[PDB]
Design a protein around this ligand. Structure first.
Ligand SMILES: N=C(NO)NCC[C@H](N)C(=O)O
Ligand SMILES: N=C(NO)NCC[C@H](N)C(=O)O
Ligand SMILES: N=C(NO)NCC[C@H](N)C(=O)O
Ligand SMILES: [Mn+2]
Ligand SMILES: [Mn+2]
Ligand SMILES: [Mn+2]
Ligand SMILES: [Mn+2]
Ligand SMILES: [Mn+2]
Ligand SMILES: [Mn+2]
Lengths: 314, 314, 314
C-alpha cells in the first residue's frame, strides 16, 4: 500500500501564529524518513501554497472565511486525487479547520468513509454558535449533512458538499465543549467518548466500541482526524488550546495502534502542532515527537516491536 | 437549589502555616463567580472568624485541642443553619480537622447522611494513636460512633456527638495509613478504596460500588469531604502532605462528576489547600485551580459540556 | 521467612558509568532498615566484589564478555547458596545483565521457577542480533533453552546452563524492542504485555492473567526481575535508557503488590538504578525512592496500610 504526505501550512483558522510552521517541524523531525522504514510506500507531495484572499471580510463574526475557503477547496482536490490512485492521505496541519478540505476530498473517492475525531474540542460550532470567528472550531459544521443549510452560506465555502452524517463520526477526547456545540451533538445524537467516558470505560473498550459502532455492519474506510491538543497538555504542550486532563501519550498510541490493526486506514490528520508555542524548546520537541510517533503508529509501529517478515534474525 | 459557601480559614489542625489562607485563594480564583454561572443559586457567607483560645494546653500529645474545639463547634452550627434552610454547604479549608465541624452540623439536619472521604490519609487516629497532636489527622475519630468513648474526652470537643457509623462512610484515595489507623479501619470493618483498589477496579467501578454500597437500599444525602492531598502531588502540589501515586486530576473529576449525577449532594469539603506551600507560583496555581474545578464539578460542569436548557443555540 | 540482600555493583553490561553505584544509593536510602520494619527476617550479605578480567577482548561486537561472565558466575553461586537455606534473594544492580547470574543461581535450588520481567526492554538479543555489545541487553538469551546454542559460545559464560523455557517467562512493560528481539519473542511464542496491552487490559487484568498463565496448573516459585527503566521516565528518570510512555509509579506498585499477595516470591531484582544519571538531585532521589518502595512492596507494605497482628491498637 502507498502513503502520500501533504503539508497544509495554514493558520487562518485561529488567532495564534505558528501552526503553519507545523508540517515544517514534523518533517524536520524525520516524519518522512521514519515512515519509509515501515512496510508502507511513502511519497512526499511537498507543502501546498495557499494564495491569500485580499481584503478577507469577516462574514459576521466568522473570520477570514475566504482564505479558509480556498485553502480547504484546494486541499480537498489534492486529497481526492491521491485517494483516487488508491494511496492513504496523511495531511499535516496547520490548524484543524483544514479538516473541511482533507475530509471532503477524501469523501469523494470513498463517500462511505467513517471519521474518528480524537480532539479535546468538537469544533462542531456553526457560524451561528461560535464566540470567535475561528473556523478551526467549526469544521464538522461544514461537513455534517444534518447541519446543511442550518446556517448562512459562507463566503468561500460554497464549494463544499456535506459528506457525512452524525452516525458515521465518533469523537474521542472531548473535554472543553461550548454550550452550542453540546446542544448540537446531543440533538443530532452523535456518538462520542468524552474524557469522562474514557475515564470510565478505558481506552481499551472505547476503541472496541467505536469500532463495532462504525464497522459493525459494513466495514468502511477510516478517516482519522487527530488533534494534537487531544492528548493532555503535559504530552503535547505546543498547541493553540491546551486543555487539562486529556488523553495520555499511551492512550494516544493505543488509539492510533488499534486503528492500524483494523487495516482500514485511508486518511489521517496530524493537526494543530504549533512549533512556536512551546514554553521551552523541549516542549515544542515533546509535542512534535509524540505527534510523529502517533503517525508512524497509524502506519505499523507497535510498542511490542516490529520484525521484517521472511528474514531469519537468528 | 441553593449553595452557600463558607470559609473556615483554620490551621491549628497541623503544624504548617498557610492552610488558613486557603479559602482566600480559592475565592481569589473566582470560585464564587464560576459557581454562579452554573444552574445553582449561590450565596457567600463570608469567612468565619476563629477566636483563639488563650493558653491552649496540649491534651497529652494532641495539640491545640481547645482552639480546634471551638472553631469546629462554631462551624457545625453555621452548617446546620444553612442545612436547615435546605441549601448545600460548601466548606473551604483550612486544614481537614474542620471536618469535625462541617460534618456534625450537617448531620443535625440530616442524620441519615453518608460520607465519601476522598483523601490520601484516613485521619481516623484517636488521641490514643496519633504520633502527632495534629488533629487534622483524627476527625473521623470524633465523628465515629464505634469509636465513641474509646479515648479520653478532649478539651473543647465535649460538644460533639458521634454522628455516623463505620457503615455510612467510604474512603477513596488512601495511600499513607498509620498502623493504628489501619487496625481501626479493619477492625471496624470500614469500606474503602485505597489506591491499590482504584488501581485494580478503575475509578469507574469504584464509584459504581461506593454508590450502591451507600445508596443500595435507602437513598440518603451525601457529604463529600475532599482532601486536596488526595489527588497525586503533580496535580495538587500545594498541600500539607504530598503523598505520591495518588488519584489523578481526571479520576478526581470523575468522582466529583458521578457524585453530581446522583443529585444527592448536600455538603462539600474543599480542604487542605495551602497557598503558601508551592515550590513555584504555578504549583500553588495548579492546586487552587484543580481545586476550584473539582468544586464546580460537584455542582454541574461536565467535561462533555453544558448548554442552558430551553434556549435554541441554532 | 528470611530475606538476604545482595549488591551486584556492576556496570560492564552497558556503556554508562554509574549503575554500579546502584545498590550503594538504594541502601543509603534505608532499603535495609525499612525492610526490617516488615514481617520479614532480613540479612545483608554486603556487596560482592567483581574481579576485573584483564584484557577483556570484545567477542565480536559483544563487549567485556569475560568480566560479565565471572561477575554473573560468582553471583549465581551466592544466590543458589541462600536459595538453599530457604531465604528470598533480593539482588541490587548494577545493570540488568546481572540477571544471568541472579536467575541461574536461583534456578539451581528451584528449577521449576517462573520469571516475571518488568522492563521497558526485552533484553532477549543474542550475540547474533545486538547492535551493541551491551550484554545488559541479552540476559534472556543466555537463560533461554529454546535459544541454547543458537549463538556462538561466549567467553566467560561457558558456565551457564539454559534454565528456563519461553513458557515460564512473562514480560510486562515492553515498549522499545529491537527487530531481532521482536522476531525471537514472536517465534518462540513468549507471553508478554507490552505497554499497548497494559494500556488495553489494565494492570489489573495483566497480573490476573500473567498469574493463571504461570500458576494455573502447578504453583511454582516466582523470580521478579524488575528493571527500573520499566516505569515511565517521569517516575524513575535516573536510568540507562529512559523510554517514554511506560508503566506508572502506581501500576508499578500494583505489580509488586499482587506478586506479594501470591506468597510465591523467591527472588527479586532491583536493577538499572544509575545514581549518576539524574538531571537534578531530586530526579536521582525520585528514582531511588520509587525503587526502594517497589521492593518493600514485594515484601508486604500495602498502600492500604499495615497493622502488626495480635496487638490491639485500641
Ligand atoms: N483549538 C480548538 N479546536 O481545535 N478550539 C475550539 C474552541 C471553540 N469551539 C472555537 O470555535 O473557538
Ligand atoms: N495531611 C494529613 N491528613 O489530611 N495527614 C494525616 C497524617 C497522620 N495520620 C496524622 O494524624 O498526623
Ligand atoms: N537498558 C536496556 N535494557 O535494560 N537496553 C536494551 C537495548 C538493546 N536491546 C541492547 O541490547 O542494547
Ligand atoms: Mn480541533
Ligand atoms: Mn482542539
Ligand atoms: Mn485529611
Ligand atoms: Mn490527607
Ligand atoms: Mn533490562
Ligand atoms: Mn530496560
Amino acid at each position: 500500500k502507498p502513503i502520500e504526505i501533504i503539508g497544509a501550512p495554514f493558520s487562518k483558522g485561529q488567532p495564534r501564529g505558528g501552526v503553519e510552521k507545523g508540517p515544517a517541524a514534523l518533517r524536520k523531525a524525520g516524519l518522512v524518513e521514519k515512515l519509509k522504514e515501515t512496510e508502507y510506500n511513502v511519497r512526499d507531495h511537498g507543502d501546498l501554497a495557499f494564495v491569500d484572499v485580499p481584503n478577507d471580510s469577516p462574514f459576521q463574526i466568522v473570520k477570514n472565511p475566504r482564505s479558509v475557503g480556498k485553502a480547504n477547496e484546494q486541499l480537498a482536490a489534492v486529497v481526492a486525487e491521491t485517494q483516487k490512485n488508491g494511496t492513504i492521505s496523511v495531511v499535516l496541519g496547520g490548524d484543524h479547520s483544514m479538516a473541511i478540505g482533507s475530509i471532503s476530498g477524501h469523501a469523494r473517492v470513498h463517500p462511505d468513509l467513517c471519521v474518528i475525531w480524537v480532539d479535546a474540542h468538537t469544533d462542531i460550532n456553526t457560524p451561528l454558535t461560535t464566540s470567535s470567528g475561528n473556523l478551526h472550531g467549526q469544521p464538522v459544521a461544514f461537513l455534517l449533512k444534518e447541519l446543511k443549510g442550518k446556517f448562512p452560506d459562507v463566503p468561500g465555502f460554497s464549494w463544499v458538499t456535506p459528506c457525512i452524517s452524525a452516525k458515521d463520526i465518533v469523537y474521542i477526547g472531548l473535554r472543553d465543549v461550548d454550550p452550542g456545540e453540546h446542544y448540537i451533538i446531543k440533538t443530532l445524537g452523535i456518538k462520542y467518548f468524552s474524557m469522562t467516558e474514557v475515564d470510565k470505560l478505558g481506552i481499551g473498550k472505547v476503541m472496541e466500541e467505536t469500532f463495532s459502532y462504525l464497522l459493525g455492519r459494513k466495514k468502511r474506510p477510516i478517516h482519522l482526524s487527530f488533534d494534537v491538543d487531544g492528548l493532555d497538555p503535559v504530552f503535547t504542550p505546543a498547541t493553540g488550546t491546551p486543555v487539562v486532563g486529556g488523553l495520555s501519550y499511551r492512550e494516544g498510541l493505543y488509539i492510533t495502534e488499534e486503528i492500524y490493526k483494523t487495516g482500514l486506514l485511508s486518511g489521517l490528520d496530524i493537526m494543530e502542532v504549533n512549533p512556536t508555542l512551546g514554553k521551552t524548546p523541549e516542549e515544542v520537541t515533546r509535542t512534535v515527537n509524540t505527534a510523529v510517533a502517533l503517525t508512524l503508529s497509524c502506519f505499523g509501529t507497535k510498542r511490542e516491536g516490529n520484525h521484517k517478515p521472511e528474514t531469519d534474525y537468528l
